[PDB]
Swiss-Prot record, chains A, B:
Catalytic activity: TSAVLQ-|-SGFRK-NH2 and SGVTFQ-|-GKFKK the two peptides corresponding to the two self-cleavage sites of the SARS 3C-like proteinase are the two most reactive peptide substrates. The enzyme exhibits a strong preference for substrates containing Gln at P1 position and Leu at P2 position
Regulation: Inhibited by pyridone-containing alpha-ketoamides compounds 13a and 13b. In turn, alpha-ketoamide 13b (tert-butyl (1-((S)-1-(((S)-4-(benzylamino)-3,4-dioxo-1-((S)-2-oxopyrrolidin-3-yl)butan-2-yl)amino)-3-cyclopropyl-1-oxopropan-2-yl)-2-oxo-1,2-dihydropyridin-3-yl)carbamate) inhibits SARS-CoV-2 replication in human lung cells. Inhibited ex vivo by michael acceptor inhibitor N3. Inhibited ex vivo by compound 11a and 11b.
Effect listed in the UniProt record for changing C145A: Complete loss of 3C-like proteinase nsp5 cleavage
Protein name, as recorded: 3C-like proteinase nsp5
Cross-link (Glycyl lysine isopeptide (Lys-Gly) (interchain with G-Cter in ubiquitin)): K5, K90
Top-level taxon of origin: Viruses
Cytoplasmic compartment segments: 1-301
Cleaved signal peptide residues: none
Effect in UniProt of substituting N142A: Does not affect ability to cleave and inactivate human TRMT1
Impact when changing K90R: In strain: Beta/B.1.351
Organism of origin: Severe acute respiratory syndrome coronavirus 2 (2019-nCoV)
Record localization: Host cytoplasm; Host Golgi apparatus; Host nucleus
Stated role: Cleaves the C-terminus of replicase polyprotein at 11 sites. Recognizes substrates containing the core sequence [ILMVF]-Q-|-[SGACN]. Cleaves and inactivates human TRMT1, preventing tRNA guanine(26)-dimethylation of tRNAs. May cleave human NLRP1 in lung epithelial cells, thereby activating the NLRP1 inflammasome pathway. May cleave human GSDMD, triggering alternative GSDME-mediated epithelial cell death upon activation of the NLRP1 inflammasome, which may enhance the release interleukins 1B, 6, 16 and 18. Also able to bind an ADP-ribose-1''-phosphate (ADRP).
This protein's encoding gene: rep
Length: 301, 301
C-alpha cells in the first residue's frame, strides 16, 4: 500500500545523455544510435536568441562547430540537419547503450518522467503531467535544455518531450522528439503567454480511487449525479469537461473499489463546493490531478 | 525555476537488483561484488512468518535452496550467512555493474531515493524521508521486499535502507544494509505499530527557503523570534524542537536569501498560527517537511 508520485527508473535514459556545445552555448543532447538530438537553439548566440533565423544561422555552420562530449569521449559530428525545432547531429559512433525506443507525442493530461541533466550528466528524476495548456510544471535551471521526458513500457523507452524554455509564469515548455512544440510556443527568447490552465478531471477521479483503495473514505457519500449535472459544477471550478470516454477509462478502478464513476463524481462535486475542511487525501490538502488512471493501477492492486 | 520532489538517477542501483527465491517466497536482493543481500524472511514459509526462529530455520537450509536470478542468468549460491535481519548470499559471479558504494545508517529527518522493485525488476523511483518515528511513507506492494533506499554523492552510492514490511497504519519499516531495523520493529507477522510522529521543523524551514529562492515571499513578515520562543509554538503544533545545529545548517540558505533563520522562524510561527488562508507554497497547501536543506541547495543550484 501507499501512494507516491513515482518516476520510471532512469538507467536506460541516463546512458543516452550527452553534452552539446556550439560556440559558448552548452546544453544536453540525446544520443540514440549514431544521432544526437538537441534543441536547435544551441546554435544561437546571446544576441541571436532574441529573434533568430535558424535556417540562416545553420547554413553558416559546419560539423566542426558542434562539440559533442560523451562523458570524456568527444564524439565526431559527421553530419547535421534540422527537423522543426530540433537539431539532429550525425556522429561517428553509434551509442552502445541505446535502448529499444520510440518517439511519441503525448496528449494533455498524460504523465511522464523527466531526467533533469546539466552538461550531459543526470541530476535527478521526477514526474510531470502535460498540462491542458501544453505546459509542464517542471524544475529546470540554466543548462537543463535537451533534458527529455519519457515513459517506459516493457523494455521500451517512449521519448515524449525535450525541454527548450521556461515561460514568465515559471512553467516550462518544449517539443516532442520530432521538434514540434507542445502548445503555441516558439523557440525565441521573447515573453509568451500560456493559455489559461484547467484541472485534469479524469486524473482527479483516478486519484480519489487511489485514495479509497488506500483506505481514505471520508469524502464518499450516498448521493449520485448525472454526467451533465457534474460537468456543470466542474465548469465553474475550471475543470476539464468529463466525457464518456473518461468515464470508460475509469472502469477498472470503479470495479476494483465498487464505487460507480458517477458516484465518485458526486464525491468530487461535494469536495469542490465545500473544500476539505481541514482534512487531507493521501497527504495532500489539494485535489491532485497529475496521476492518470494508468498511474493509479500501476501502483495499486 | 520550479521545485519538485526529485529522486536521484537510479541507473547505478538498477544494475544491482536481482530476484531471490527460497521455497515459494520471492523478493528482491542487492548484488554487490560476489554477495547478494536480501531480507532474511525470504527463508520463511506461510506458517513460518508468524513466529520464526531464523537461526533454526537457516541451519536447515542448503545453498541450493536459494534461487537467485539476475535477468535471465541464474546465479549459483556458494555460501550464506545471516547478519541481523539481512541474508548475505555469496555467489559465483561478482557483479560487473557494481558501482562505488558504501553502507550507511541515516538519521531521522534525512531523505533518500527508493527504487521500488518486483521480481528483481526496477518498477519506479521516488523520494522518502526517514520519519522521526523511524517509518517511511512509501509505496510498496507484496514482492517489494529487498528494494533499497540510497543517496548518491559524486560517484558513491550510499545504500541506507532495505524494505521489509508495512505497518497497520500503511507506512513502511525496514533496516539498514547491516540488517538492523530502523525503529522498534521486528521482521515477523505480529501486531506492531509506529510510534507517534512529528514534523521535521528544520526541513519545513529549508522548504520555505526554496519558496523564496523561487520568487515567492507572501508568507514572510516583519516579526522575529527567539529560538526558545519559536520552539514553544513548535511543541504546540507537534513540530520537532529546532536546535542551534539546525540553525547553523540553515546558514547557507539564509545567506543566499538574506533572510535570517530566526526571521523565517517567525514566518513559520505565523504560518502555524494562522494557516495559509487558501494560498499555497510551491504548489502545496501543506507545509512540506520532506526536503532537507541539502535537497534544496542541490535542486535550486
Ligand atoms: C535551456 O538550457 C534553457 C532552459 C530555461 C532557462 C531557465 N530554465 C529553463 O527552463 N532555455 C532557455 O534559456 C531558452 C532559450 C530560447 C532560445 C527559447 N529561453 C528561455 O527559457 O528564456 C526565458 C528564461 C530564461 C532564463 C531564466 C528564466 C526564463
Ligand atoms: C515483502 O515483500 C513484504 C512487503 C510488504 C507487503 C505489502 N507492503 C509491504 O511493504 N513484507 C511482508 O509481507 C512482511 C513479512 C514479514 C514476515 C517480515 N509482513 C508485512 O508487511 O505484513 C503486513 C502486510 C502484509 C501484506 C499486505 C499488507 C500488510
Amino acid at each position: 500500500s501507499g501512494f507516491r508520485k513515482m518516476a520510471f527508473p532512469s538507467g536506460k535514459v541516463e546512458g543516452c545523455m550527452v553534452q552539446v556545445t556550439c560556440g559558448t552555448t552548452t546544453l544536453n543532447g540525446l544520443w540514440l544510435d549514431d544521432v544526437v538530438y538537441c534543441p536547435r537553439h544551441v546554435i544561437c548566440t546571446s544576441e541571436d536568441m532574441l529573434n533568430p533565423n535558424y535556417e540562416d544561422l545553420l547554413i553558416r555552420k559546419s560539423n566542426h562547430n558542434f562539440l559533442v562530449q560523451a562523458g570524456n569521449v568527444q564524439l565526431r559530428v559527421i553530419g547535421h540537419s534540422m527537423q522543426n525545432c530540433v537539431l539532429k547531429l550525425k556522429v561517428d559512433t553509434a551509442n552502445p547503450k541505446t535502448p529499444k525506443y520510440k518517439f511519441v507525442r503525448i496528449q494533455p493530461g498524460q504523465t511522464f518522467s523527466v531526467l533533469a541533466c546539466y552538461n550531459g550528466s543526470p541530476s535527478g528524476v521526477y514526474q510531470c503531467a502535460m498540462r491542458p495548456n501544453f505546459t509542464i510544471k517542471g524544475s529546470f535551471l540554466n543548462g537543463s535544455c535537451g533534458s527529455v521526458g519519457f515513459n517506459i513500457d516493457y523494455d521500451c523507452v517512449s521519448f515524449c518531450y525535450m525541454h527548450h524554455m521556461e515561460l514568465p509564469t515559471g512553467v516550462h515548455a518544449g517539443t516532442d522528439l520530432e521538434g514540434n512544440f507542445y502548445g503555441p510556443f516558439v523557440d525565441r527568447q521573447i515573453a509568451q503567454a500560456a493559455g489559461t490552465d484547467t484541472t485534469i478531471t479524469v486524473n482527479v477521479l483516478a486519484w480519489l480511487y487511489a485514495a479509497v483503495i488506500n483506505g481514505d473514505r471520508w469524502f464518499l457519500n450516498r448521493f449520485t449525479t448525472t454526467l451533465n449535472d457534474f460537468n456543470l459544477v466542474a465548469m465553474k471550478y475550471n475543470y476539464e469537461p468529463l466525457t464518456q470516454d473518461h468515464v470508460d477509462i475509469l472502469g477498472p478502478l470503479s470495479a476494483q473499489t465498487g464505487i460507480a464513476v458517477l458516484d465518485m463524481c458526486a464525491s468530487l462535486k461535494e469536495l469542490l463546493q465545500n473544500g476539505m475542511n481541514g482534512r487531507t487525501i493521501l497527504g495532500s490538502a489539494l485535489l491532485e490531478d497529475e496521476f492518470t488512471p494508468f498511474d493509479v493501477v500501476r501502483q495499486c492492486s
